[PDB]
Amino acid sequence: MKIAVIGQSLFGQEVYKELKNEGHMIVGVFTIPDKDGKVDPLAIEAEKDGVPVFKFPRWRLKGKAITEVVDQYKAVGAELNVLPFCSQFIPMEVIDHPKHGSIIYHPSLLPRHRGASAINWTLIHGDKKGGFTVFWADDGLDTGPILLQRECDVEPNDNVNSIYKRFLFPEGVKGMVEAVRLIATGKAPRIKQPEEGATAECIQKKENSKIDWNQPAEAIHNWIRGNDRVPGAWAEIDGKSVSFYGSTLLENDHFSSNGQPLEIPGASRAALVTKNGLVLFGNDGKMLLVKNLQFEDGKMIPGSQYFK
Numbered sequence: 549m550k551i552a553v554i555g556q557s558l559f560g561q562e563v564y565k566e567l568k569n570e571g572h573m574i575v576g577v578f579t580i581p582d583k584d585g586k587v588d589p590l591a592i593e594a595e596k597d598g599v600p601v602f603k604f605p606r607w608r609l610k611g612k613a614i615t616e617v618v619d620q621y622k623a624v625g626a627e628l629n630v631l632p633f634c635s636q637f638i639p640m641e642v643i644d645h646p647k648h649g650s651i652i653y654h655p656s657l658l659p660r661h662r663g664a665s666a667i668n669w670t671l672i673h674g675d676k677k678g679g680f681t682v683f684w685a686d687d688g689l690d691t692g693p694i695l696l697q698r699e700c701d702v703e704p705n706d707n708v709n710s711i712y713k714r715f716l717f718p719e720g721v722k723g724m725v726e727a728v729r730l731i732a733t734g735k736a737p738r739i740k741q742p743e744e745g746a747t748a749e750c751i752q753k754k755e756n757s758k759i760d761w762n763q764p765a766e767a768i769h770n771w772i773r774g775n776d777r778v779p780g781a782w783a784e785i786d787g788k789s790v791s792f793y794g795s796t797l798l799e800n801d802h803f804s805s806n807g808q809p810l811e812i813p814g815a816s817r818a819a820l821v822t823k824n825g826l827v828l829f830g831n832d833g834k835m836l837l838v839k840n841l842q843f844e845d846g847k848m849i850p851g852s853q854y855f856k
């Protein structure tokens with residue numbers, strides 16, 4: 549069928565590539581402008597194929613969509629919009645245009661974790677299960693009827709990158725391709741999202757990924773892994789903003805109080821720099837271990853190396 553792909557990143561590129569390989573006519577790719585150095589992976593693959601690339605800035609403003617952004621979109625004659633990873637909200641004029649409407653990839657088990665940082669919040673809340681949903685776009689934020697959903701176990705030490713790479717990305721691509729196949733064969737469903745279990749959270753950025761030390765250790769571990777790698781959980785240490793990556797919970801033994809103490813303002817008590825990383829304490833007397841640290845405009849350093 550005729551498809552407009554609206555989105556970005558490696559994920560949008562892989563979905564584009566698979567749909568093209570399945571015989572679909574990609575009539576247009578609508579993506580972010582270069583930054584301004586690198587061209588987005590999706591525009592690169594599209595032009596390599598001879599497919600109309602668009603780099604619109606934003607569609608909405610003053611409560612409204614333009615006509616110059618709408619009209620260039622409508623020209624390509626899409627029968628379905630596919631929104632693999634779309635960094636912004638798209639006007640209903642665009643969303644409702646094609647005969648089949650629009651489908652969106654969302655890396656959570658909707659109606660849980662509506663919002664743009666769903667993977668982060670899945671881990672921050674310490675959910676045992678996670679996954680993704682392909683849903684039909686409506687005017688609300690991640691509220692549209694479900695086409696399909698796929699589920700996975702969240703591992704205790706999963707960070708954003710590991711669950712994404714293990715499951716959300718590769719299976720998300722297959723889910724998007726399957727959704728289109730169900731649509732093309734005329735069998736795709738529209739399951740209204742249940743009321744029960746709905747949540748929505750804010751988008752995670754550097755500023756609001758600051759660590760709140762007054763929480764039990766498990767909560768701090770979840771907060772850290774839930775913001776690892778991006779935006780990167782952080783705290784003030786000795787005047788510097790320091791980011792924390794690679795958290796695990798640390799049980800036994802003592803332990804080991806053989807590190808060099810490291811004072812962290814607001815921490816329930818001083819941290820310990822050990823050969824295996826930075827031991828941190830929650831407000832419940834329990835411990836977590838952080839493998840890697842990072843300063844502003846700096847490389848990753850092992851927590852074990854803080855004092856050298």
Ligand SMILES: Nc1nc(O)c2cc(CN(C=O)c3ccc(C(=O)N[C@@H](CCC(=O)O)C(=O)O)cc3)ccc2n1
Pocket residue numbers: 631634635636637638639640643652654662663664665685686687688689690691692751
């Ligand atoms: N009509 C419609 N409906 C949805 O549910 C959409 C979901 C998504 C995917 N998404 C899931 O949370 C999402 C991603 C980003 C945004 C967003 O508002 N992004 C801006 C913030 C505001 C803006 O500039 O638009 C940004 O780049 O940070 C909203 C929703 C994308 C487009 C959608 N369009």
